[PDB]
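Follow-up to my post from last week.
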Amino acid sequence: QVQLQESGPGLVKPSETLSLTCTVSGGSISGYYWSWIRQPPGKGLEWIGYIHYSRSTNSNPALKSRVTISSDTSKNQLSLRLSSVTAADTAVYYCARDTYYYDSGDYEDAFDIWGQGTMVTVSSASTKGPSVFPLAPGTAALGCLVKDYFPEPVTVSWNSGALTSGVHTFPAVLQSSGLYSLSSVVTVPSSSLGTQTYICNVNHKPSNTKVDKKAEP
Amino acid sequence: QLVLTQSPSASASLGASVKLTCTLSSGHSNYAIAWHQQQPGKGPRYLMKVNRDGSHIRGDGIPDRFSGSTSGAERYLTISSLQSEDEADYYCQTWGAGIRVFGGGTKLTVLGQPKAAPSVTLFPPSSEELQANKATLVCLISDFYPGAVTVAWKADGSPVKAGVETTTPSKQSNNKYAASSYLSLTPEQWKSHRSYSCQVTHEGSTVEKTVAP
Ligand SMILES: CC(=O)N[C@@H]1[C@@H](O)[C@H](O)[C@@H](CO)O[C@H]1O
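User reply:
Got it. Predicted complex:
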């Protein structure tokens, strides 16, 4: 039940330093190497580097001059600092549990638990929260239109997470304004339209925006 | 230098088997690897470690349809009884001295899934959006396979090309595709026409929905 959770700003300006944390729950960081990995949108996985809290740290030769990885035993946390960022550093960033070292010094290689990832966008544009509009409705579709936000992502749940079946949240579209929009839809039984309410819960962490909207007939 | 070579894509039919390949550079031809799977829209998850001696160890919860094997510098992931959810990107990964390396990834297509015609819903601009002095028509295209469509918009039967944004079809949780098309208008444009329509073409057949102010 070891779980990894990445966190950090979703937006940084070019030339700034990106700072992320990886918090481990359900187990200790002791004994393992912990790796950082990133994935630019639509591209492959790139290893950034790793750390063992008492053995060593290292990083990808192409990023080493900009990468500092550290650990905090009291917080059960790993950290990544990436300096002098550019648009080429826009990516989802992951941490993962890597090789275990026995205190004899022997080891068993592993790479068996991933975090969920945190999206980072490098841009001089300012954060903007979304505007949310309902898409009003033996099956019927209804939804929510989530307009004009930056950076990605927004999360959309329905009925405070209680409704997860006919739900589909679409990929965002990048507008010529530089802002994103998306929609989230649910297919519901028509017989439920007069009695069950449907409320989308929109979360935009970069702007700390939280909006509920009812999609009513 | 330590290099893992994967070809970018692979393909096989629903219910068949497929063997994905990862090739180690010659100076590291005895290394173990790990296989990772990334289904569309999700983060990666670990599948298994494949050892030099040909043995393999699956991660907890990974189906036994996934197996691994070895031949020389080649490392394999065999997926049997292919299902729709196996469409994903598969990455091999290894461990060197002070470094870890990923292959470039292989995108697996699972062919021959059941054909499904799209269900189209066309939403007019909400009264809330019109009160904000904006207008978006939203054409929702649901539950189709294969995952390619084209969309045509019309205003009173005349084609509309400006202000159209259409998403690339995405797999739904039920393994059929969905897509969305948006037509951006001013409120005055919306109210000036008798109706607008969204026409979706899928496998040579068209479905049309109309909305009126
Ligand atoms: C901490 C670390 O990088 N350990 C690596 C190990 O993962 C790898 O299998 C081996 C290859 O010879 O080299 C070691 O230095």
